[PDB]
Amino acid sequence: GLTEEQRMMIRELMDAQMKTFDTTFSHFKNFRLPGVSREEAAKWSQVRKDLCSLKVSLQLRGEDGSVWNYKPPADSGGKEIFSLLPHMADMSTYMFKGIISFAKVISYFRDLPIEDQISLLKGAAFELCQLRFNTVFNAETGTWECGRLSYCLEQQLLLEPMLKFHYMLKKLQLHEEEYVLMQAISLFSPDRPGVLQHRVVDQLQEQFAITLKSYIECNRPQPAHRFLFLKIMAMLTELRSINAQHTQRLLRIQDIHPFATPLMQELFGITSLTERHKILHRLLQE
Amino acid sequence: GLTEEQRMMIRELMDAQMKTFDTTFSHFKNFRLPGVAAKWSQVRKDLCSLKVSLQLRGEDGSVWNYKPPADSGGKEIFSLLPHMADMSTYMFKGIISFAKVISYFRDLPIEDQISLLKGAAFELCQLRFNTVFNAETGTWECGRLSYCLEFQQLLLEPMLKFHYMLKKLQLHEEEYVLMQAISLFSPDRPGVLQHRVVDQLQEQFAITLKSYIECNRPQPAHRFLFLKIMAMLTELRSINAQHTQRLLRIQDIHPFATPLMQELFGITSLTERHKILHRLLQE
Ligand SMILES: CC(C)(O)CNC(=O)C[C@H]1CN(S(=O)(=O)c2ccc(F)cc2)c2ccc(C(O)(C(F)(F)F)C(F)(F)F)cc2S1
């Protein structure tokens, strides 16, 4: 169906995925859990909007069958709005370490300069996390099934860009190979801030895009999936728009309530690329 | 009507109840929680019948709910035990404080103070838990903490039957506190030397309770109330004997009791053998 170069490209991405994506969250342990001025007011009013827009309940299923469940608090008008942030900080960081490992194991990425690698990971980390999270998303129950951990959502949610993305991507019933090809397309994005070898990255992305188009023609019937490829490219455009939204969101919260882990500060630009990104450089050279 | 001596007696117990019973459970903190041989066949039969889910409401409105694991079998049946022991110890410390602020109890030799406390701790705890028990939901509403029952099968557990039965009488605060005093001043407890004084004390609290009822409960619903309460107390003594035996069987195959519980229950001269009690009674 596809060429041998195309089959081997997929095989490389699928290997990279099986090796670095802990699908059952079996190594995500020792994480934190929620406990048992005119200019500043404008900041707090905005941050309150950023957080109350997405509400989930936590479910922790014990090995024995015991179930711990965390229902979030209402906006009383204080710090309670930040109860889930250290837990989300640990979850994001775990997910990011997986994504750095994923990129690192790909030859086309490994063969790029360290500075380009850093810039590509800074620009794509969140996007790759969401695509990965989409694979554990249950659209019937409104839940992300993260092994023993579950995140249960509480047309009200269909307005929230992040939620509409998960519901829509899940609707496409994508294959493991298609999710992984979406990951490469997003990772090898030439238009990222700080990318030097723009030409090489553009030729790499186009080859991943061609392989995805070719994979759809060979593996899917006629013609229900006629525009599946273009539907996928639309989702990635939307994903990049949610990424810009999410960076402004995170930075605003970080500004009034510091919560990001050391790796999150590096990825998001919270206070010479190798000098400003020492954790990332270590992780890439391991 | 009530005599001046009876009115003062109620007043004192009521004042002792408020000083020593934190009904909102606001000072209950730093407690353990479940993690995020034919004796085993009997110990499992003790634990299984008393199945509860735990709820924790934060000041913010946030709620942590714990659903327990099923049997077979398996050390998972001992999940709520460290927590239960922390809650018990906290209640027993309030019961100890309750006894201490009572003049009638203070004027007793330290050995009898220990003997009465060892005999009544569980009984007084059960009486105080009944006041926070909601019979409509089967929940002990202990402030931020809630213990919810997971039917004729539920009623097969005497401790659980006692709670529904006692709640049906719809007792006043004065009646609950007089029951505590009657159960505390039990002359028949092991090691009680001052039998006569304790028995005289018990008869005056029982007389005070009878007088309180005649003076305040004239409704047909409350006919025979005094004798029902007295039958409930005898029933509470029976449950207490069964509970001590259940605890000793659980502790033997799975040690969980705090140092105060080991003292109160016997788990291993009176003042030396009960150092913590002796300290608490002096402090
Ligand atoms: C008043 C309250 C209690 O309602 C406030 N809302 C919450 O505490 C919801 C949590 C969960 N979510 S979420 O609902 O958007 C979500 C949950 C699970 C998922 F897998 C994906 C999204 C989330 C996601 C990212 C992020 C972050 O990326 C963000 F803070 F946005 F930067 C983080 F990981 F860095 F923290 C935060 C949250 S907070």
Place of tokens 């889930």: A84
DSSP A81: G
* Closest atom of ligand 1 relative to the A154 alpha carbon: 14
Q: Is the peptide bond before A269 cis (omega within 30 degrees of 0)?
A: no
Within 8 A by CB and 6+ apart from A21, the residues are A98, A102, A132
Q: How many domains does chain A have?
A: 1
Q: Residue A8 sits in which domain range?
A: 1-286
What token pair was written down for A137? Answer: 């998303």
Separation CA B93–CA B21 (nearest Å): 10
To test ligand 1's pocket by mutation, which of A48, A56, A239 has the most ligand atoms within 8 angstroms of CB?
A56
Separation CA B146–CA B186 (nearest Å): 31
Q: Give me the phi and psi of A149, to 5 degrees please.
A: -105, 140
CATH number reported for the structural domain that contains residue A40 in this entry = 1.10.565.10
Reduced to 3 states (helix: H, G, I; strand: E, B; else coil), residue A246 is: helix
What token pair was written down for B234? Answer: 């005898």
In short, whether A144's Cβ falls inside 6 Å of ligand 1 is yes
**Under an 8 Å CB criterion, which residues of A touch B?**
33-36, 60, 62, 64-74, 76, 80, 83
What's the A85 CA to ligand 1 centre distance in angstroms?
A: 7
What's the A247 CA to ligand 1 centre distance in angstroms?
A: 13
Within 8 A by CB and 6+ apart from A132, the residues are A21, A95, A98, A99, A183
CB contact under 8 A, B74 and A80: no
A144, β-bridge pairs:
A137, A151
Report the first-to-last Cα separation within chain A, whole angstroms: 37
How many Cβ pairs closer than 8 A exist between chain A and B? 59
> Whats the size of chain B, residue-wise?
283
Asked whether A131 and A186 are in contact (CB, 8 A), the reply is: yes
Pick the closest to residue A66 from B200, B244, B144, B75 (CA basis).
B75
What token pair was written down for B200? Answer: 């005289």
The kind and range of the H/E element at A133 are: helix A114-134
Cα B146–chain centre separation: 17
Pick the closest to residue A256 from A42, A32, A31 (CA basis).
A42
Burial of B161 (0-12, 13-18, 19+ CB in 10 A): middle
Q: How many angstroms separate the CA of residue B24 from the nearest CA in chain A?
A: 16
Burial of B149 (0-12, 13-18, 19+ CB in 10 A): middle
Reduced to 3 states (helix: H, G, I; strand: E, B; else coil), residue A195 is: coil
Separation CA A91–CA A96 (nearest Å): 9
Separation CA A274–CA A279 (nearest Å): 9
CA dihedral (A45, A49, A50, A55) positive or negative = positive
DSSP A158: T
Separation CA B192–CA B198 (nearest Å): 8
Q: Is B217 left (phi over 0), alpha (psi -120 to 50) or beta?
A: beta
What token pair was written down for A191? Answer: 């238009």
Separation CA B153–CA B134 (nearest Å): 19
Separation CA A184–CA A181 (nearest Å): 5
Separation CA B190–CA B118 (nearest Å): 9
The kind and range of the H/E element at A89 are: helix A85-104
Give the mutation candidate from A25, A32, A36 for the B interface (greatest B CB count, under 10 A): A36
In short, whether A47's Cβ falls inside 6 Å of ligand 1 is no
CA angle A119, A120, A125 (to 5 degrees): 110
The kind and range of the H/E element at A284 are: helix A278-285
Question: Which of B56, B62, B79 has its CB closest to that of A66?
Answer: B79
Separation CA A177–CA A229 (nearest Å): 13
Q: CB neighbours (10 Å) of residue A144?
A: 19
CB contact under 8 A, A62 and B36: yes
Give the mutation candidate from A33, A70, A82 for the B interface (greatest B CB count, under 10 A): A70
Reduced to 3 states (helix: H, G, I; strand: E, B; else coil), residue A146 is: strand
Q: Which residue of A has its CA nearest to B54?
A: A68
* Closest atom of ligand 1 relative to the A264 alpha carbon: 35
CB contact under 8 A, A73 and B67: no
Resolution in A: 2.6
Cα B37–chain centre separation: 31
Pick the closest to residue B113 from B274, B244, B254, B258 (CA basis).
B274
Q: How many angstroms separate the CA of residue B37 from the nearest CA in chain A?
A: 23
Question: Which of B64, B67, B69 has its CB closest to that of A36?
Answer: B64
Question: Which of A60, A68, A73 has its CB closest to that of B62?
Answer: A73
Q: How many angstroms separate the CA of residue B143 from the nearest CA in chain A?
A: 14
To test ligand 1's pocket by mutation, which of A32, A85, A88 has the most ligand atoms within 8 angstroms of CB?
A88
Q: Structure solved using which method?
A: X-ray
Asked whether A66 and B33 are in contact (CB, 8 A), the reply is: no
Q: Which residue of A has its CA nearest to B58?
A: A36
Pick the closest to residue B85 from B269, B259, B281 (CA basis).
B259
Residue B274 annotated as binding site: no
Sort strands A67-71 and B63-67 into parallel, antiparallel or unpaired.
antiparallel
Separation CA A184–CA A204 (nearest Å): 9
Give the mutation candidate from B60, B66, B146 for the A interface (greatest A CB count, under 10 A): B60
Asked whether A172 and A228 are in contact (CB, 8 A), the reply is: yes
b/e burial code for range A79-101 (CB count within 10 A of at least 16 → b): ebbbbbbbbebbbbbbbbbbbbb
Separation CA B201–CA A125 (nearest Å): 76
Residue A225 annotated as binding site: no
Q: Which residue of B has its CA nearest to A78?
A: B60
Pick the closest to residue B186 from B130, B267, B121 (CA basis).
B121
Reduced to 3 states (helix: H, G, I; strand: E, B; else coil), residue A56 is: strand
Question: Which of A65, A67, A72 has its CB closest to that of B62?
Answer: A72
Asked whether B123 and B236 are in contact (CB, 8 A), the reply is: yes
Separation CA B240–CA A62 (nearest Å): 34
Pick the closest to residue B50 from B170, B138, B176, B141 (CA basis).
B138
| DSSP-assigned states of every residue in chain B | ---HHHHHHHHHHHHHHHHH--TT-TT--S-------THHHHHHHHHHTS-EEEEEE-TTS-EEEEEPPP-SSSGGGGSSHHHHHHHHHHHHHHHHHHHHT-HHHHTS-HHHHHHHHHHHHHHHHHHHHHHTEETTTTEEEETTEEEEE--TTGGGSHHHHHHHHHHHT---HHHHHHHHHHHHS-TTSTT-S-HHHHHHHHHHHHHHHHHHHHHH--SGGGTTHHHHHHHHHHHHHHHHHHHHHHHHHHHHHS----HHHHHHH----HHHHTHHHHHHHH-
In short, whether A52's Cβ falls inside 6 Å of ligand 1 is yes
Asked whether A32 and A69 are in contact (CB, 8 A), the reply is: no
Sheet holding B52-57, edge to edge: A137-138, A143-146, A149-153, A56-61, A67-71, B63-67, B52-57, B145-149, B139-142, B133-134
